[PDB]
Each structure stands twice: as structure tokens, then as C-alpha cells.
Design a protein around this ligand. Structure first.
Ligand code: NA
Lengths: 90, 59
């Protein structure tokens, strides 16, 4: 299959969609699940990588997420923790 | 480069690899010679497949 169809299968398997962010700054929006239920926006570059999220997260949580991305440099681990946090916040 | 090309690189960077030659998906979280292999069989629900994959990524 073509790239768009492979993208569609990843979205189905992970229930993870990668969308343009609303932010100029945090320009990647990760969307979890079947609706616009859980999402978090991030910047792929910089010190200040964590943007807005729905459910809003508290500062302690946002700092944890920031470090997985900036310090650990581990996108999968960041998505795992962010998904768990956002789902628990619903 | 186009947008899907990048999305695919991003998914792949998670260690999740489509192996459609074999009707399965591979999960390589540790890069240590061990992988999880998930059949794409209609048999398991989408919910079960998603839950399983996120469990593997969370290890
Ligand atoms: Na995008």
C-alpha cells in the first residue's frame, strides 16, 4: 500500500494521529483515541517542548513529560506517559 | 519529502514496524534482539491490539 494507507494502519493500530498543532510554536499535535478526546501539542525543537493539552495537565505532570522528551530524548516513552496521564484525566 | 513520509518516519521511530509481507506488526522497543510479533488477524479486536502495543512500548 501507499504511504497514506500505511499511515492509516498505524493510526488504527496505535489509535494515534499526528496532526498540525494549533500553535506556531508547538506545531505537532498528538491525538489519542477515537475522538478529539486526548491530545497534546509539542515542539520538535527547543528547551520548551510541551505545549497545550486536552485534558489540561498540572505543572508537575508537564515537567515530567518535558524531561522524557528533552532529557531522555525518547518519543515512545513520552507518548506512553502522556497517553496514560491524559486518559487518567478524562 | 511529504507529510505522510514524515509521519511514517515518526511511527517507525517508536519501534513499531509494519510487516505486511507476513500479515503482522513488529514491536522493537529494546533493540536487543528481542521483538514482539502481533498478527494482523481480524480475530483479535482493534481494542486488544492497541492495548497490547501500548503495553509493549511502555516496557
Ligand atoms: Na503533522
Amino acid at each position: 500500500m501507499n504511504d497514506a494507507a500505511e499511515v492509516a494502519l498505524y493510526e488504527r493500530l496505535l489509535q494515534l494521529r499526528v496532526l498540525p498543532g494549533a500553535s506556531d510554536v508547538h506545531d505537532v499535535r498528538f491525538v489519542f483515541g477515537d475522538d478529539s478526546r486526548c491530545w497534546i501539542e509539542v515542539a520538535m525543537h527547543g528547551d520548551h517542548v510541551i505545549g497545550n493539552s486536552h485534558p489540561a495537565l498540572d505543572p508537575k505532570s508537564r515537567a515530567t513529560l518535558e524531561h522524557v522528551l528533552t532529557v531522555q530524548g525518547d518519543l515512545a516513552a513520552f507518548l506512553v506517559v502522556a497517553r496514560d496521564m491524559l486518559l487518567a484525566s478524562l | 519529502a511529504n507529510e505522510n513520509i514524515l509521519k511514517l518516519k515518526l511511527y517507525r521511530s517508536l519501534g513499531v514496524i509494519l510487516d505486511l509481507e507476513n500479515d503482522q506488526v513488529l514491536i522493537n522497543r529494546k533493540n536487543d534482539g528481542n521483538i514482539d510479533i502481533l498478527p494482523l488477524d481480524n480475530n483479535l479486536s482493534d481494542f486488544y491490539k492497541t492495548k497490547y502495543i501500548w503495553e509493549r512500548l511502555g516496557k
